[PDB]
Amino acid sequence: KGEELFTGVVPILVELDGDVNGHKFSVRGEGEGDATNGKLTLKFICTTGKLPVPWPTLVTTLVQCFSRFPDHMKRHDFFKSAMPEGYVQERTISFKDDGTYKTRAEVKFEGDTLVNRIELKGIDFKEDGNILGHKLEYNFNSHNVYITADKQKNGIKANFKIRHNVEDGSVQLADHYQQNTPIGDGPVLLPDNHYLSTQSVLSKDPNEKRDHMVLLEFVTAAGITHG
Ligand SMILES: [Mg+2]
Ligand SMILES: [Mg+2]
Ligand SMILES: [Mg+2]
Ligand SMILES: [Mg+2]
C-alpha cells in the first residue's frame, strides 16, 4: 500500500465544479498515470459548454502523487503515503493584478482509480483582464514546487509562482499557496524541504468537437542540494 499502489499504470478521474465571477462550469478528465516514470496523460472536457476561463489557468488545479521519486527520497513522499485514504489539497491562486481562485480538492483512490475531485471559486476577476478576456496562450511553462512539512496539521505546504504566457509577450503570474492534509488519521511521511519539478504540454484532440484540453506531464522529485 502507499507507494505500492502506484507501481504500474493507474487510471485517473478528475472532476471539477467551478464558479468564476458567477460563471459556473464543470470539467471532467480521464487518463492515466505512471509514477515510476513520472508520466501523466489526461484529456479534459468542459461538460457544460464553453469554458469561461482559459484552459491553462486550470492546469495546476486539475495529482502530485504521480511524481517520480528517486529511491532514497521515497520515504519523504507525503502524497503516496497518504494513500489510499487520500489527502485534501487546498490552494489560493492569486493572479497578479487580477482575481483569485480558491480551490478545495480531495485526492484518493476509488478502487483502481486515482480520483481528484475539486471545487473552485474564482472572485474579483476583471471583465477584460487576461483571464475572463481569454488573453493567455495555449501553452505551459515548467515549474518547481517547493514542499515543506507542516507537522501541526500533519501535512505539507507549498508556495510557487506559475508563469502564464500572454498573447502580447507578457507573463501573467499566478501565485500559488497550497496546503495538503491527510484524510486518514495515521502518520504519514513528511518531506525534508524537497521540490517537485513539472513540465507540461497542452494539445488538442483533432476528432474532439467539445471544448477540451489534452495534457501530457512529466513530474519528478528532487532534493535541494543548495539554493
Ligand atoms: Mg454540470
Ligand atoms: Mg484556453
Ligand atoms: Mg505546451
Ligand atoms: Mg488541506
Residue list, CB under 5 A from ion ligand 4: 88, 90, 179, 181
Cα separation, 115 vs 19, in Å, equals 21
132: left (phi over 0), alpha (psi -120 to 50) or beta: alpha
What are the contacts of 156-163 at 24+ separation with CB within 8 A? Answer: 156/78, 156/180, 156/190, 156/191, 162/60, 162/93
181 CA to middle of ligand 4, Å?
4
CATH code, domain with 11:
2.40.155.10
Q: H-type helices in 134-188, by residue range?
A: none
- In Å, how far are 7, 143, 223 from 107, measured between CA atoms? 18, 21, 24
Q: Which amino acid is at 136?
A: L
Strands 23-34 vs 10-20: parallel, antiparallel or unpaired: antiparallel
Number of domains in the chain: 1
Q: Which domain holds residue 74?
A: 2-223
Contact 167, 135 (CB under 8 A): yes
86 CA to middle of ligand 4, Å?
11
If you ran DSSP here, which 8-state letter would residue 129 be given? Answer: S
Q: Residue holding cell 528532487?
A: 222
Helix (H) or strand (E) holding 18: strand 10-20
184 CA to middle of ligand 4, Å?
12
Residue list, CB under 5 A from ion ligand 3: 139-140, 201-202
Helix (H) or strand (E) holding 78: helix 78-81
Contacting residues for 134 by C-beta, under 8 A, at least 6 apart: 53, 54
